[PDB]
Each structure stands twice: as C-alpha cells, then as structure tokens.
Amino acid sequence: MRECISIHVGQAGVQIGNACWELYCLEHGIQPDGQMPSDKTIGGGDDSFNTFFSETGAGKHVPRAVFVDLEPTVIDEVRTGTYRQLFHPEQLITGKEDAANNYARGHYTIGKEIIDLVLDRIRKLADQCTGLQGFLVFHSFGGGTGSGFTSLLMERLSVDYGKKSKLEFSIYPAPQVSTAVVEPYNSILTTHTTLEHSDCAFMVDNEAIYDICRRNLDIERPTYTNLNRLISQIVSSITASLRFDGALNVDLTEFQTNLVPYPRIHFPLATYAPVISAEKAYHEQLSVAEITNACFEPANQMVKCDPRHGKYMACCLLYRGDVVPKDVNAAIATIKTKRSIQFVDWCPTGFKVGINYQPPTVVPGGDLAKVQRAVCMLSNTTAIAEAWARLDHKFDLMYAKRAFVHWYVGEGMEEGEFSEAREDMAALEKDYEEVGV
Amino acid sequence: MREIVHIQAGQCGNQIGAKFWEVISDEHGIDPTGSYHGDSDLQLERINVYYNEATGNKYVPRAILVDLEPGTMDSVRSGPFGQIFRPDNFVFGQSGAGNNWAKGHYTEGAELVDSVLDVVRKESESCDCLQGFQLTHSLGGGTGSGMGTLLISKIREEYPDRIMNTFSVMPSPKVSDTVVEPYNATLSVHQLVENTDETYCIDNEALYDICFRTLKLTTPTYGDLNHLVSATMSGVTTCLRFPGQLNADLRKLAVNMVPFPRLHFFMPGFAPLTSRRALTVPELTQQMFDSKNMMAACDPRHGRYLTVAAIFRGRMSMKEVDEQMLNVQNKNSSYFVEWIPNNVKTAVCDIPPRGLKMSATFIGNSTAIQELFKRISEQFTAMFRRKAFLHWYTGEGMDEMEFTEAESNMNDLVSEYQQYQDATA
Amino acid sequence: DLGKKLLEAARAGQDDEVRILMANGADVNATDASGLTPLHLAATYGHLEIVEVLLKHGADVNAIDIMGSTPLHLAALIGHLEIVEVLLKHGADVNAVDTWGDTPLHLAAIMGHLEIVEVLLKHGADVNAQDKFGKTAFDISIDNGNEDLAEILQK
Numbered sequence A: 001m002r003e004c005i006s007i008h009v010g011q012a013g014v015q016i017g018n019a020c021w022e023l024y025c026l027e028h029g030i031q032p033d034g035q036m037p038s039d040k041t042i043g044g045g046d047d048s049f050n051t052f053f054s055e056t057g058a059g060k061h062v063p064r065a066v067f068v069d070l071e072p073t074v075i076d077e078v079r080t081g082t083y084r085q086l087f088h089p090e091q092l093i094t095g096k097e098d099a100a101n102n103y104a105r106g107h108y109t110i111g112k113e114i115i116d117l118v119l120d121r122i123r124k125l126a127d128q129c130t131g132l133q134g135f136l137v138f139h140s141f142g143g144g145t146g147s148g149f150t151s152l153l154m155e156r157l158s159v160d161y162g163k164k165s166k167l168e169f170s171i172y173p174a175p176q177v178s179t180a181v182v183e184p185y186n187s188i189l190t191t192h193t194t195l196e197h198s199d200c201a202f203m204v205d206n207e208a209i210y211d212i213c214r215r216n217l218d219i220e221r222p223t224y225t226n227l228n229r230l231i232s233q234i235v236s237s238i239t240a241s242l243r244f245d246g247a248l249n250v251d252l253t254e255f256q257t258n259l260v261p262y263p264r265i266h267f268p269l270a271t272y273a274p275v276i277s278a279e280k281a282y283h284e285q286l287s288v289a290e291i292t293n294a295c296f297e298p299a300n301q302m303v304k305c306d307p308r309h310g311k312y313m314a315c316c317l318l319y320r321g322d323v324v325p326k327d328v329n330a331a332i333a334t335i336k337t338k339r340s341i342q343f344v345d346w347c348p349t350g351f352k353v354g355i356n357y358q359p360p361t362v363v364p365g366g367d368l369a370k371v372q373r374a375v376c377m378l379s380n381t382t383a384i385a386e387a388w389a390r391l392d393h394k395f396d397l398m399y400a401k402r403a404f405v406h407w408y409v410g411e412g413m414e415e416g417e418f419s420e421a422r423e424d425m426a427a428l429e430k431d432y433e434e435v436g437v
Numbered sequence B: 001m002r003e004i005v006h007i008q009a010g011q012c013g014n015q016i017g018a019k020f021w022e023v024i025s026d027e028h029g030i031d032p033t034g035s036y037h038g039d040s041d042l043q044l045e046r047i048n049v050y051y052n053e054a055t056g057n058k059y060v061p062r063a064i065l066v067d068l069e070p071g072t073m074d075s076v077r078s079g080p081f082g083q084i085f086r087p088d089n090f091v092f093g094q095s096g097a098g099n100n101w102a103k104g105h106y107t108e109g110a111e112l113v114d115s116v117l118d119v120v121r122k123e124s125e126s127c128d129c130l131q132g133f134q135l136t137h138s139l140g141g142g143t144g145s146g147m148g149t150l151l152i153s154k155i156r157e158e159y160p161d162r163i164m165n166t167f168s169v170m171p172s173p174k175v176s177d178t179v180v181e182p183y184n185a186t187l188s189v190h191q192l193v194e195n196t197d198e199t200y201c202i203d204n205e206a207l208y209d210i211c212f213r214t215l216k217l218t219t220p221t222y223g224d225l226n227h228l229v230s231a232t233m234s235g236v237t238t239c240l241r242f243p244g245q246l247n248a249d250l251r252k253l254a255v256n257m258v259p260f261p262r263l264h265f266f267m268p269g270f271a272p273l274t275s276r277r278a279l280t281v282p283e284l285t286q287q288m289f290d291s292k293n294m295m296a297a298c299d300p301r302h303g304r305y306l307t308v309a310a311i312f313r314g315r316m317s318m319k320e321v322d323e324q325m326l327n328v329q330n331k332n333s334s335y336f337v338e339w340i341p342n343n344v345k346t347a348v349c350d351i352p353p354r355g356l357k358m359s360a361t362f363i364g365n366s367t368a369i370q371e372l373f374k375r376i377s378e379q380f381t382a383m384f385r386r387k388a389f390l391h392w393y394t395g396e397g398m399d400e401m402e403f404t405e406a407e408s409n410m411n412d413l414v415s416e417y418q419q420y421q422d423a424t425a
Numbered sequence C: 001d002l003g004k005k006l007l008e009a010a011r012a013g014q015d016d017e018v019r020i021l022m023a024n025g026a027d028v029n030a031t032d033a034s035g036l037t038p039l040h041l042a043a044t045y046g047h048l049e050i051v052e053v054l055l056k057h058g059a060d061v062n063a064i065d066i067m068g069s070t071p072l073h074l075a076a077l078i079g080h081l082e083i084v085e086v087l088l089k090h091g092a093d094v095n096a097v098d099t100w101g102d103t104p105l106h107l108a109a110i111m112g113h114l115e116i117v118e119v120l121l122k123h124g125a126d127v128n129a130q131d132k133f134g135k136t137a138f139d140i141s142i143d144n145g146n147e148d149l150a151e152i153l154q155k
C-alpha cells in the first residue's frame, strides 16, 4: 500500500474533487462523517482503499486530499456541504482575491501569496504517508487559478518531491459553458509550464461532457453539477485501480508505463461506456461486446477528436462489473477485425485489460442509470493533437493582435512568455505529427 | 473580493448617483432608514458589495458624495433616500466650479480633494477585500469633469491594484447649458483613457433621442434621462449584487471585456426602453442590439464589436437565450471581430428589476464608439480654432498646449478604434 | 489709445463704458493682435445691446480677423440667436468663409444651434458650401447622426 494525494486547484478542480470524493465514499462504503462500518481494523490498516484514505483512532476515514483556491466561494461550499466533516479542515485552503481569469495572477502575483502555505500543508499530508507515490492534480485550463497556480504548484512539487509521480485531470475549455474569453491563453500558458512536470494528464473536454449530457442523459442545458457527476464517474473508473485490488494500473508509475511511450506525448484519451439516463431504469443490459465497441465511437470520448485519422501507441480497457474475461478477449478480437485501429510500428499491439468485478456505483442524486457492466478505455492516440490544434488556433487569432496581453504583462509575466509557450505547443503538435508517420 | 466604494461628483454625478442608490436599495429591500424589510434571502446575500452593515441591522451605502457646489448636497439629502447616506461622507465646498474644468481640476477642486481622499481612505480601510471603485459624474461640467478626473488620478496613485470604473455622462447640445462642454469633456476623456479600467459612456445625445423619438416625450427632463440611466446602472451592477452562480469580481469582468487598455469605453443598452406586456427573449435580444436602444449615440453597424456582455433578468428559457444570442452572431458575424473567438457572453439573473418581468442590459465594447468621440472632437476643434473662452481656462493656470495635447489624445483614441475596426485575421 | 479699452469693454459687456469711449473718439473698428474688433468680441460673448450700439456707430459688420472669422461666424458658433438676427439685419455676409472653409452655417450645425441654422438658411445660407475637407453642413449632420439637424437642413 502506497499513498496517493489528490490536489484540487481552482473552482473547476474543487467542484470536480467534491464530486469525486462523494463517489469514492459510496464505492468504499464510507459515510459523510468518515465512518466505515465494513472496515473492521479500527484506526488503521493497509487495505487498497488506504491509498486514498487515512484513518483516525475514532474510525474516521479521511481523504488524502487538498483543496486550494484563490477566493473562498467554492471551498466555503465544501466546508458546509454534506461532506463538511470528511476532509482535514486545514487541507481546505483559500485566499481572498482570485486570479481574475489571468494565468499571470495565478502563477506570479496572487498565487505567490499562498504557495508556501499550500506546500507546508501538503507536506503535512506527505509526512503521514509510509510510501507516498505521488499526486493527482485536478484543475481547469481556462481559469487563472486552475492554469497559473497549478503551474506554480507543479513546479514547486517537482523540486520538493523529485521522485514522485504527478498525474493531471485537466478541464479543457468549451465556450458553451464558459464566460472566459482569454481561456485559450491560459490553456497554452499552463500546458507549456506544466509539460515537464506532469507524467500523465487526462484532459476532459467540457464540450464532450456537455454533448454526452445532452445526447445520452437528455439534459437540455447541463449545469456544472451535471457535468461534474459524469466527469466524476469517469475519474473514478480511471483511479479505481489505485484504490482496489487489481492487475492493471496498480500504481501511478504503471500509468506512465502503460500509457505514455515518451514523456511529452503524455495525454491519453479516455472513452467511457455506457452512459444511460437514470430515467431508463429498465434498459436492457448491454453485452461486453457492445460496451467495448462503444469505446471506439467518437460520441463516448472525453475529448472531441477523431482517432480514426490518428495512430495508437497504447490501449488499456478498465472494466467494472459482471464481465467474464473470455468475453472481453472475444470482443477485442472482433474490434481488431471490424474496425480500422492502426498502431504505430514500435509498440506492442495488444490491449491491456483490467476487470473490477464490483458493479459500478452511481450517486443517487445523479443522472445515470445503474448498469451491470461498464468500461473505460484509455488510449494514447495521436488524434488528440486535434484538441491542441483547436486551442492553438484561437490563441493565434488573439495573439496576432496582442488582444488582452496587457493584463498578463501587468501581473508579473514577460510578454516573451506568450511566444515561448506557443513555440512549445508548436513543437508538441510536431511531436504528434512525427509519431503519426 | 467583495466591497465596492462608490463616489459621486458634481451635480450630474450626485443626481444619477442618488437615483442609483434609490433603485438598488429597492431591489435589495432597504428602506430610506437603512432598515432591511425585504422578502427574499437573496436580497441580502451580496448586500455587503455596496452597503456597510451598521448596528441594529442597518445598512449604509458605501458612498462618498462630492461637490464644489453646496446646494447639490442639500438636494440629495432631501431626496427620498437622502438620510440614508453617512453624513460624514458629504464632502462639499462653497464656491462652485462654474462649468470650468480648470477650476474643478486645479483650483477649487484641488483644495478639496484631500478631504475627499480622507473619506475614501476611511471607507477603504474597513473593507474585507476591496474590489475597486465606481464613480458617477458628467464630463461636460466643471466639478464632475475636472475634479472627478483629479479624484480618479489620486485614487489610481493610492490604490493602483484596485479596479476603477466610471459612469460618465457625455454632453450634447440637445441637453446643454453652454458651449464650453466640449472643452470640459475633451480634457476629461484623456484622463479616463489613462486612469480608468472601464467607462460606461452615458451619452446625453442618445438619452435625449430615446426620450424624444422613441418614448414620444415632447420635452424630456433630466428625470426622464435619468430614468434610463438608473435602469442601465442597475443592470450593469446586477452581476455583482445578485451573482447567482457566476463567480466574477470587477477585475475578472474587465479582463474579459477589455482587450486593449485604452479601448475601455463601453456602449450601454437596455431593453425594454420605458418612460415613467412583458417582452419575449427574441424581442429582448433584438432590442438590445438595435442602435435605437443604445445609451451612446453611435451606430454599432458602423463599427465592429470587440467584446459584448449581456445580462438578462427575469424568468426565461436559458436555452432560448442561447439560441437568440447565437442567431445575432450568425446573421451579423461580420460585425463581431473574428480574432477574438467567442467574444459575446451572457448571464441570466432570475430576479427582475422594478416594474418589469423581463429585461436585458447590453454592454458593448464596439469600435463604433469612435463616433461619439469624433462628435465631441469636432465641437472641441470648432471652439478651439476660434480660441473661444480660452481665458476662462488659462486664467486658472492652464496652458494652451494643454488644449492642444487634449485634442491630440482625443484623435489618437479615434485612430486606435479605426485601426481595430479594419483589422482582419 | 482708447482702442484697447473699447475692445475690453465690448468683451466684458460694459455697456456704459462702451458709450463713454465712443463719445471720446475711441476707434469702433479697433483691432486686437489677432484682428478681432469690438463687434467680434461683443458678438462672441453675447452682449446684444453692445452689438446694436457698435453697428449704430460705424462698426464693420463683415470685418474679418486674421483667421477669416466674421462677427456672424462667432455668433453662430457660440449660439447667440438675437445677435445672429441683428448682424444679418445690418448686412452680415451669411456665406462668409473663414480660413478653415467654414461658413456660419457650418459652425451652427457643428454646435447644434438648430434655431440659428434655420435663420441662416432663411437668409440664404449656402447648403452646397464645402469646408476644407469637402463637407457641407448637411454632410456634417449625416456624418454625426444628427437627424434633427439633417431634417432642418433639407427645405
């Protein structure tokens, strides 16, 4: 048992974190006050769920989680929500004045006022660990805190925890549910400064999640609540292997081994099925073949892109529920013949498979029907570079006119950082092009 | 950040400022004695943005009242909510400014400004996390224009890290006491270009045209004009007083509205335009973008939108709002610059204003605002070429080159707007 | 030299002082350094009775300063309607052009003096007169969106 610390930065990271830990508690049988009747070792243990929860002498199971924001509105809701007693109160950390959708404020001027406290509080959690393996960092690309403070924190964590893995869950901007015109800037700036410091990053395209809510869950105008419960379902499917017994992705290092062939191309595409409206409680159950085929349908992807015009470097299937291994193998065999799924010539072409036989969990207030079996496919495809191309294009349109740049230069950033970041993104798009061959 | 500090300067500034406090006090359930007798808990959730809480559940506007003329402070105090303001926050002289920017900026105004700053400092010191400042004033007089811009410069120096927004009333011969108003406004605009983050251009030319031509008021009064102004100011501050779910202070809104620091002069609009049935969402959207609804006398179809914000208030289909906002950008895509992607943003507040179930407030950052500045510049130049009444300003120490400088800065601003109106991606 | 004193009395609206200086030989057509006469100054500052007095005692209604401004230009610019009427009655050139190519009609239009625009038109103001940028008064009213003025300028 080696511990993992989850860090949630900015509004998006905090609100998604709240949804994730609610679901985690449900999956492990933990109550909102931290009690876990099924855990018969009171005040301690080394079970798989202890990677994410510590224990107090009173039987309280406490998330290994830190929440950070530069204004208090969102974290104040955690302090008073259903799970107000779950977290370490000192691991909920807020400033007074936010980054105003300005990367430079989050990274330089405002972020610098709280970074040392955040690191000292993370150190307190790390000191609790017998064998810390690393960090899971949740944040938006588009916010000034999610972009700028996350980059600052990742830089500092690399210095203070040199051998620890750092994984990201990053919210990629969609104008349908955003009011930040400068998000393309913040997105490129944080990607440039974080690339060296992140070992694996799962982008979540808000437009993809929006589409799924509208099309599969029949929600006309998705709220952040709708988006976050779906995102939390997918995050849980990705982190389950760290929290339960299993054979695939059993620690943070293995995520990199399985999904990241070399360090800069570290952005796997997640695809999740099935997503069924809770109104359809009596849906006929889908087969292993059906949910597996669904993983290669663009409609179920977490990021909008077309893997049919890219190359695969890695493919892992993480099943949950009533899934017989022989049926997975036959479905995979069918996938290769029916579909055109092209791998690069230097990687093994086999699909790695994990099965967690516990039925998937849904939150009662959620929009999802219970299902007997579900699957999250994690692939590293060059097609995800289309997501970078879209961001880089919006960046270029605005930067050609230097629109909004004065806000950043007035908050501790040199103007040269814009072109430095954009050149790094150009090199990243070239990295994908060269791997695509 | 939460608190805003409000300053109102001069006759116009205090008149529209008083109406602002009447209107938002009613919206928040605050009576003229500062007592809260509202009905909804949402009325108090963000009350601290504009009100200090005193003893006995008493709310006091965070407002400073300034004038070189004593009479104006008397008229505000006798107004409906006159007794609601902090008596020590009245800072007035006795001489007046005589519609002379120079007197407001260099003479009588300079002698009074430090007293105003002392009150500002006292209000700022008691804020948990000050967002910044809002100032109401006219540009055509002497106190609001000359002393108002002096106050802005002094505040910018002392609070460089705080947002400074103005509601600035632009002069028009249609509502005019004197031909020196173009002087006073031109001298003021250079100050606003350098020292404010956002300026709402409240154009008396547009206000008059709305009342006379749209509302059919044969003889518009200041009260008629100010009815439009208070509706606009209520709508522009709604996102800070009833934030609902948006998480945005003044700075975050300025970041997303102002792509170039000097080009921060906004065209406000409001629907429905009324004088003292409910519209549909399509009607709200159509009227908001209509030139006749603009509170600045500029034709938006003569320029391009850099950014647009729109605040809908009332019970309405969020989806329908999205469809209508989409339709406007699609049918008229050429009037929104293509090099600022997704540059039109909207919010919906469930709580409607007084007397209306459906309303919308428009905030346009359009290059067409150059038409307003060209109008003032042409009048300024007509007067300045004949050197008319310059000795009223040179007599207060001003130099003729200061007029030349103001003319040049004005036309540089116009040139800057034209540059981005013709730009392409 | 009573010329400078008459210029100042005319500018300041010192009616009794204007009468005294003229009675003692003051030059009614004195000029300051820029060529402005007492009549220019009285017309600029709105002193109607002084405008009348000067015209009754030999003032040149169409005198120009160094920039080509006539008294009518200045009354039309500042907006003194009664003075505009008096100047026209005493033979002011309704279409005098200054060094910027402006006529009185241009200046009344720019400054929004709508009653003065109507009077000038009635006295034969040239709707086709172009300033140095090619603009007639009507062009100014269309360019600046002054629908009330544009309507007046069409007759």
Ligand SMILES: Nc1nc2c(ncn2[C@@H]2O[C@H](COP(=O)(O)OP(=O)(O)OP(=O)(O)O)[C@@H](O)[C@H]2O)c(=O)[nH]1
Pocket: A009, A010, A011, A012, A013, A015, A016, A069, A070, A098, A099, A100, A101, A102, A140, A141, A142, A143, A144, A145, A146, A147, A171, A172, A173, A174, A177, A178, A179, A180, A183, A206, A224, A227, A228, A231
């Ligand atoms: N899926 C999801 N996206 C969110 C949420 N909150 C914000 N987003 C998006 O994140 C971006 C805005 O960044 P925020 O996270 O709100 O900003 P922040 O990190 O708090 O930084 P500042 O407020 O600028 O200091 C937009 O793209 C939002 O659509 C959320 O709860 N869930």
Ligand SMILES: Nc1nc2c(ncn2[C@@H]2O[C@H](COP(=O)(O)OP(=O)(O)O)[C@@H](O)[C@H]2O)c(=O)[nH]1
Pocket: B009, B010, B011, B012, B013, B015, B016, B069, B097, B098, B099, B100, B138, B139, B140, B141, B142, B143, B144, B145, B169, B170, B171, B172, B175, B176, B177, B181, B204, B207, B222, B225, B226, B229
């Ligand atoms: N819309 C509006 N304009 C006003 C008001 N009062 C004065 N003005 C306008 O403001 C200008 C005169 O400035 P004023 O505020 O009276 O002078 P100050 O006291 O020296 O600041 C003119 O353009 C007037 O038309 C008012 O109550 N409402």
Ligand SMILES: CC(C)(C)c1[nH]cnc1/C=c1\[nH]c(=O)/c(=C/c2ccccc2)[nH]c1=O
Pocket: A179, B134, B165, B198, B235, B236, B237, B238, B239, B240, B246, B248, B250, B253, B254, B256, B257, B309, B310, B311, B345, B346, B347, B363
């Ligand atoms: C998303 C939305 C519509 C809220 C938005 N996006 C960018 N701007 C705004 C609105 C405003 N933007 C502003 O800058 C604004 C300024 C203000 C607010 C209160 C008092 C004085 C000025 N008031 C607003 O309502």
Ligand SMILES: [Mg+2]
Pocket: A010, A011, A071, A098, A143, A145, B247
């Ligand atoms: Mg935030």
